[PDB]
Amino acid sequence: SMEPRKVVLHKGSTGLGFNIVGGEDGEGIFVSFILAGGPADLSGELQRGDQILSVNGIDLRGASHEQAAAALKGAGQTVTIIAQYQPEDYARFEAKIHETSV
């Protein structure tokens, strides 16, 4: 896999400009969506399938969705993220089956 790297964003009128998923069913925290024109987009330094490993020194390896949301939303505007591209893990995540007709 690609090595983790540091990404620094400055929140604005729509926050950091991305969505997270995961932190449930034993899964990591993933970037699911990047808002066109938002800070994440304009930076060019985050993409869908990045795993969020830490936020302002808060370790989100193994974090719940709630813990990750609290770290990201509770942060002030300058957010220092350690992210790692995890395309295969994310692809699996997105294909998981949640409802089955029997």
Side-chain angles (χ1 to χ4, degrees), residues 9-12 15-16 18 54-58 60 67-81:
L9 297 172
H10 192 51
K11 296 182 181 187
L16 296 169
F18 71 95
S54 71
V55 169
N56 289 345
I58 303 163
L60 299 180
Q67 286 168 341
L72 285 155
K73 292 172 67 174
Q77 290 177 245
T78 302
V79 188
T80 301
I81 298 165

Side-chain angles (χ1 to χ4, degrees), residues 1-64:
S1 300
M2 300 189 70
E3 294 295 320
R5 80 291 176 192
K6 182 175 292 176
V7 178
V8 184
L9 297 172
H10 192 51
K11 296 182 181 187
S13 49
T14 58
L16 296 169
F18 71 95
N19 292 2
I20 55 162
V21 296
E24 59 181 339
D25 199 38
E27 301 281 9
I29 305 295
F30 298 98
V31 176
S32 58
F33 171 80
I34 295 167
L35 178 64
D41 183 28
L42 293 185
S43 86
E45 295 169 73
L46 274 187
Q47 73 180 303
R48 295 202 330 114
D50 277 328
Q51 187 181 352
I52 303 305
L53 307 185
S54 71
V55 169
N56 289 345
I58 303 163
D59 194 352
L60 299 180
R61 300 168 187 79
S64 63

